[PDB]
A paper describes a structure:
The Y96 position is of particular interest. Alanine substitution (Y96A) abrogates interaction whereas a phenylalanine (Y96F) increases both interaction and MTase activity. In order to understand how residue 96 plays such a pivotal role, we determined at 2.0 Å resolution the crystal structure of this nsp10(Y96F)/nsp16 complex. Strikingly, the absence of the hydroxyl group does not alter the topology of the interface. Wild-type and Y96F residues superimpose without significant difference at all atomic positions (not shown). Either Y96 or F96 is in direct contact with nsp16 helix αZ, which carries the catalytic residue K46. Detailed surface analysis using PISA indicates that the position of K46 in Y96F nsp10 is identical to that of K46 in wild-type nsp10, ruling out a better alignment of catalytic residues of the Y96F mutant. The nsp10(Y96F)/nsp16 differs from wild-type nsp10/nsp16 in the SAH binding site, though. When compared to that of wild-type, the SAH occupancy is much lower (∼0.3 versus ∼1), leading to poor density definition. We thus attribute the increased activity of the nsp10(Y96F)/nsp16 complex relative to wild-type to a stronger equilibrium association of nsp10(Y96F) with nsp16 than that of wild-type nsp10 with nsp16.
The SARS-CoV RNA cap 2′-O-MTase is a heterodimer comprising SARS-CoV nsp10 and nsp16. Nsp16 is unstable in solution, and nsp10 acts as a scaffold for nsp16, yielding a stable dimer active as an RNA cap-dependent (nucleoside-2′-O)-MTase. The nsp10/nsp16 crystal structure shows that nsp16 adopts a typical fold of the S-adenosylmethionine-dependent methyltransferase family as defined initially for the catechol O-MTase. When bound to nsp10, nsp16 is active as a type-0 RNA cap-dependent 2′-O-MTase, ie., active only when the cap guanine is methylated at its N7 position.
Author numbering:
A (entry chain B): 11 to 85, 90 to 129
B (entry chain A): 2 to 134, 141 to 292
Write the structure that this text describes.
C-alpha cells in the first residue's frame, strides 16, 4: 500500500522490498500483464512478448522497482521492453526481476529456463 | 459472428441519420466479467482496438511515429502504451503523455496538461484515451487542443483513434472525421456496456470529404447505442497469433500543396502514402 514510498525512502531500496515482503507485506501490484500466444522464445527480456507455455509476459517498466518508485537505477534494462516471468512467480514480477539474473549466453533466467 | 469480433463499428445506416440528441441508456461502470484473470481492462480494451485497427488501411512507414495522449492510469502505469509497444513495429517512435506522472514503456513520456505538449514534427498515428470525470453540450478542454493537433501535426495519410463517451465528446472532432478517407465510432467488445467508443479516422486528407455536423453525429451515435445493445465479449483476446501491425513499408514523401493532385489523394485514400517531413523528432514541455 505504502510499499513504493517505503522502498523509495530506503538507503537500499531492494533490501527494503525484501524486508517488506519478509514482514508479510503484499507484493507490488499493477504490473501490466499482456495478452500473448504463449509460443514465444521464452527469453527473459525482449522487444515484444515472448512468453512460452510456462511464462507470463509483462510490460517492463511496470515490473521495475526503480521505475515504479521513481528513483535512481543502480546503473533501465526493463523499461520499453517486455519481461517474461515464470507463471508460478507471476504474483510478484517486481520481486522476480530483483531476485533473478539473465544468463549472458542463452538470454533466459538463471535457474528457471537457462541450460 | 459479432461476438468473435474485437468490437462493433457504428453502421453507415446510423451515421446517415439526423437524430435529435437524447440521453444514453448505458452506464460506463460495471463488473466486467469478460476480462480474463490478471488482465487489466485497459490492456483488453487497447488489444481489441489494435485488433480492429488491423482490419483498416493504416499507413505503416519504415520509421513510424505514434503519439499517445492520456496514457496514465491512476495505478501510475501505462497499460495502453504497453499494448501499443506490443502492437507497433519494433523501432517505431512511441511518445506518450498525461497530466499526471506515470511509468511507461514509451520512448518518451511527457507530463503535464496536453496543451503544454509542443512539437514541430508530424505524426502517423494519434491515440487518445483522455477523459475528465443539465445539458449535454460539446466539450472543449483537451478536445480543443486535440483538433488543433490533428490539423497541424497529423501527416496526410495518418490515422487517429480518440476516446469519447456520452458526455465526453466534441462537435469539431466529429466534423474533422469527415476530413479522413473513412471514419467510424468503434465500441470494444470487452467494454460494450459502456457509452465509450473510439472515434477512428483512417487516412487523413487534410480537407473535407463529407460535411459532418458534430452535434447531429453525436446524437446519431447515441441513438445507435440506445437501440443496439451489445453483449460483452472477450472472444477475440484468445487468439493473439496475428496481432502485430503489418509491416507495410509505406512510402513517406514531403510534397508541396501543388504536387498533391488527384493521383496523390487517391494514394492517400487507399492507405498507400504518408506525407510529411522526416526531420529529427523533438517533443517537449
Ligand atoms: N486535459 C488533459 N490533459 C492531459 N491528460 C488528461 C486530460 N484530461 C484527462 N486526461 C487523462 O486521461 C486519463 C483518463 S484514464 C486513461 C487510462 C490510461 N489510458 C491507461 O492506459 O490506463 C487520465 O490519466 C487523465 O490524466
Ligand atoms: Cl526480495
Ligand atoms: Cl488481429
Ligand atoms: Cl479502411
Ligand atoms: Cl451530420
Ligand atoms: Cl506503393
Ligand atoms: Mg479504403
Ligand atoms: Na494511416
Ligand atoms: Na459519459
Ligand atoms: Na446544427
Ligand atoms: Zn526501471
Ligand atoms: Zn544460459
Amino acid at each position: 500500500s505504502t510499499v513504493l514510498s517505503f522502498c523509495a525512502f530506503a538507503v537500499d531500496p531492494a533490501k527494503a522490498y525484501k524486508d517488506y515482503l519478509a514482514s508479510g507485506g503484499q507484493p507490488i501490484t499493477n504490473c501490466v500483464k499482456m495478452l500473448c500466444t504463449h509460443t514465444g522464445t521464452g527469453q527473459a527480456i525482449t522487444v515484444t512478448p515472448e512468453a512460452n507455455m510456462d511464462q507470463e509476459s509483462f510490460g517492463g517498466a511496470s515490473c521495475c522497482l526503480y521505475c515504479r518508485c521513481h528513483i535512481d537505477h543502480p546503473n533501465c534494462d526493463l523499461k520499453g521492453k517486455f519481461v517474461q516471468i515464470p507463471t508460478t512467480c507471476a504474483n510478484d514480477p517486481v520481486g522476480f526481476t530483483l531476485r533473478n539474473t539473465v544468463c549472458t549466453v542463452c538470454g533466459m533466467w538463471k535457474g528457471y529456463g537457462c541450460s | 459472428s459479432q461476438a468473435w469480433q474485437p468490437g462493433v463499428a457504428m453502421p453507415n445506416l446510423y451515421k446517415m441519420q439526423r437524430m435529435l440528441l437524447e440521453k444514453c441508456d448505458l452506464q460506463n461502470y460495471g463488473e466486467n466479467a469478460v476480462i480474463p484473470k490478471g488482465i487489466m481492462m485497459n490492456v483488453a480494451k487497447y488489444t481489441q482496438l489494435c485488433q480492429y485497427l488491423n482490419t483498416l488501411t493504416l499507413a505503416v512507414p519504415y520509421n513510424m511515429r505514434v503519439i499517445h495522449f492520456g496514457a496514465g492510469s491512476d495505478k501510475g502505469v501505462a497499460p495502453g502504451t504497453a499494448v501499443l509497444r506490443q502492437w507497433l513495429p519494433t523501432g517505431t517512435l512511441l511518445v506518450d503523455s498525461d497530466l499526471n506522472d506515470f511509468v511507461s514503456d514509451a520512448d518518451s513520456t511527457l507530463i503535464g496538461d496536453c496543451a503544454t505538449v509542443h512539437t514541430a514534427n508530424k505524426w502517423d498515428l494519434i491515440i487518445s484515451d483522455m477523459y475528465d470525470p443539465k445539458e449535454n453540450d460539446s466539450k472543449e478542454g483537451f478536445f480543443t487542443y486535440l483538433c488543433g493537433f490533428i490539423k497541424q501535426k497529423l501527416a496526410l495519410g495518418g490515422s487517429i483513434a480518440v476516446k469519447i463517451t456520452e458526455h465526453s465528446w466534441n462537435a469539431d472532432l466529429y466534423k474533422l472525421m469527415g476530413h479522413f478517407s473513412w471514419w467510424t465510432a468503434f465500441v470494444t467488445n470487452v467494454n460494450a456496456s459502456s457509452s465509450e467508443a473510439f472515434l477512428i479516422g483512417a487516412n487523413y486528407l487534410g480537407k473535407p470529404k463529407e460535411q459532418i455536423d458534430g452535434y447531429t453525429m453525436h446524437a446519431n451515435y447515441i441513438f445507435w447505442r440506445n437501440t443496439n445493445p451489445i453483449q460483452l465479449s472477450s472472444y477475440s483476446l484468445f487468439d493473439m497469433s496475428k496481432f502485430p501491425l503489418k509491416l507495410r513499408g509505406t512510402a513517406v514523401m514531403s510534397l508541396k500543396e501543388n504536387q498533391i493532385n488527384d493521383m496523390i489523394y487517391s494514394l492517400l485514400e487507399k492507405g498507400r502514402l504518408i506525407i510529411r517531413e522526416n526531420n529529427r523528432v523533438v517533443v517537449s514541455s
